[PDB]
Scaffold this active site. Sequence first.
Site, mmCIF file in Angstrom:
data_model
loop_
_atom_site.group_PDB
_atom_site.id
_atom_site.type_symbol
_atom_site.label_atom_id
_atom_site.label_comp_id
_atom_site.label_asym_id
_atom_site.label_seq_id
_atom_site.Cartn_x
_atom_site.Cartn_y
_atom_site.Cartn_z
ATOM 1 N N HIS A 40 -79.140 -41.614 36.704
ATOM 2 C CA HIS A 40 -79.471 -41.740 35.288
ATOM 3 C C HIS A 40 -80.979 -41.704 35.035
ATOM 4 C CE1 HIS A 40 -80.002 -46.215 35.836
ATOM 5 N NE2 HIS A 40 -80.769 -46.096 34.766
ATOM 6 N N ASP A 84 -74.032 -43.460 40.546
ATOM 7 C CA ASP A 84 -75.381 -43.405 39.982
ATOM 8 C C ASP A 84 -76.446 -43.350 41.074
ATOM 9 O OD1 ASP A 84 -77.449 -43.395 38.153
ATOM 10 O OD2 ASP A 84 -77.316 -45.534 37.690
ATOM 11 N N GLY A 175 -86.644 -50.241 33.224
ATOM 12 C CA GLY A 175 -87.884 -49.923 33.906
ATOM 13 C C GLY A 175 -87.742 -50.106 35.406
ATOM 14 N N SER A 177 -84.936 -49.512 36.764
ATOM 15 C CA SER A 177 -83.931 -48.483 37.014
ATOM 16 C C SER A 177 -84.262 -47.550 38.178
ATOM 17 C CB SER A 177 -83.744 -47.652 35.745
ATOM 18 O OG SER A 177 -83.930 -48.458 34.592
ATOM 19 N N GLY A 178 -83.289 -47.352 39.065
ATOM 20 C CA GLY A 178 -83.482 -46.473 40.207
ATOM 21 C C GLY A 178 -84.181 -47.123 41.385
HETATM 22 N N1 LIG Z 1 -86.459 -41.218 31.741
HETATM 23 C C1 LIG Z 1 -85.594 -41.136 30.735
HETATM 24 N N2 LIG Z 1 -86.031 -40.789 29.529
HETATM 25 N N3 LIG Z 1 -84.427 -41.495 31.163
HETATM 26 C C2 LIG Z 1 -84.141 -42.758 31.471
HETATM 27 C C3 LIG Z 1 -84.363 -43.184 32.776
HETATM 28 C C4 LIG Z 1 -84.017 -44.471 33.161
HETATM 29 C C5 LIG Z 1 -83.442 -45.338 32.241
HETATM 30 O O1 LIG Z 1 -83.009 -46.554 32.660
HETATM 31 C C6 LIG Z 1 -83.235 -44.930 30.931
HETATM 32 C C7 LIG Z 1 -82.796 -45.855 29.990
HETATM 33 N N4 LIG Z 1 -82.415 -46.998 29.913
HETATM 34 C C8 LIG Z 1 -81.849 -47.850 28.856
HETATM 35 C C9 LIG Z 1 -81.845 -49.166 29.301
HETATM 36 N N5 LIG Z 1 -81.351 -49.476 30.488
HETATM 37 C C10 LIG Z 1 -81.423 -50.852 30.945
HETATM 38 C C11 LIG Z 1 -81.194 -51.046 32.447
HETATM 39 C C12 LIG Z 1 -80.810 -52.319 32.856
HETATM 40 C C13 LIG Z 1 -80.628 -52.628 34.200
HETATM 41 N N6 LIG Z 1 -80.303 -53.851 34.611
HETATM 42 C C14 LIG Z 1 -79.874 -54.827 33.812
HETATM 43 N N7 LIG Z 1 -79.852 -56.079 34.263
HETATM 44 N N8 LIG Z 1 -79.430 -54.566 32.587
HETATM 45 C C15 LIG Z 1 -80.832 -51.643 35.161
HETATM 46 C C16 LIG Z 1 -81.208 -50.365 34.768
HETATM 47 C C17 LIG Z 1 -81.387 -50.070 33.421
HETATM 48 O O2 LIG Z 1 -81.756 -48.813 33.056
HETATM 49 C C18 LIG Z 1 -83.577 -43.639 30.552
HETATM 50 CU CU LIG Z 2 -82.129 -47.890 31.604
#
Ligand SMILES: N=C(N)Nc1ccc(O)c(/C=N/CC/N=C/c2cc(NC(=N)N)ccc2O)c1
Ligand SMILES: [Cu+2]
Length: 223
Positions: A40, A84, A175, A177-178
Amino acid sequence: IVGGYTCGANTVPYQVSLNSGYHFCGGSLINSQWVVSAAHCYKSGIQVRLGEDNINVVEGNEQFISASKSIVHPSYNSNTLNNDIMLIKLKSAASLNSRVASISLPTSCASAGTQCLISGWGNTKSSGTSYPDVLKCLKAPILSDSSCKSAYPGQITSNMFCAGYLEGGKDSCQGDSGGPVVCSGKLQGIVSWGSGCAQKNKPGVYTKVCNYVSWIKQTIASN
Ligand SMILES: N=C(N)Nc1ccc(O)c(/C=N/CC/N=C/c2cc(NC(=N)N)ccc2O)c1
Ligand SMILES: [Cu+2]
Ligand SMILES: [Ca+2]
């Protein structure tokens, strides 16, 4: 990372920042030419930044290398976030040293209760928003599959696991993420999703890396 601590400059040598003009995701270096991240987090024009602590200040140990190819898992489903995971190849091999090092892939899956290290430059507030410039760390246990499924009915697949605290207060966030979830020197998870951050009964959900070692190895061997 919410409720964590300042890691310390270059103390998580395998942690990378994916940059597209700004930091947007974390990643883990698994060898001199490849990075593992979340599917993602996919986007074109990615520059991998290694040896980073403060992502807004050049401190002296950074290595900026453009990505030459991205490979999203063949079965990634963006709606359910099942599978993912994504591989990113660097245009040039990174120079490995004490501050820029690869993290080993697991030989077996971790168990509930296993303590792990989660890190990233994501939001540090459970409510509101505040992005740190330096890398943040959080030590957290993997939760049982039953508790994970009870926390997120009908959403947890065999390629996911929860980690964190059901009481809330400590978790990964946007942030991060990944980014990596390392347990005993092995990459067992990838920051994938959750509901809000550090909320009670809503622990972070992570991609179960041990299920993908065969795919990762075979893919790297042919690309
Ligand atoms: N580069 C883009 N424009 N795309 C992109 C890349 C990464 C991205 O994550 C997103 C967009 N993300 C929306 C929010 N994600 C929360 C999130 C929460 C958690 N953990 C939690 N304990 N909730 C973990 C991961 C998560 O991403 C959009
Ligand atoms: Cu996210
Ligand atoms: Ca820097």
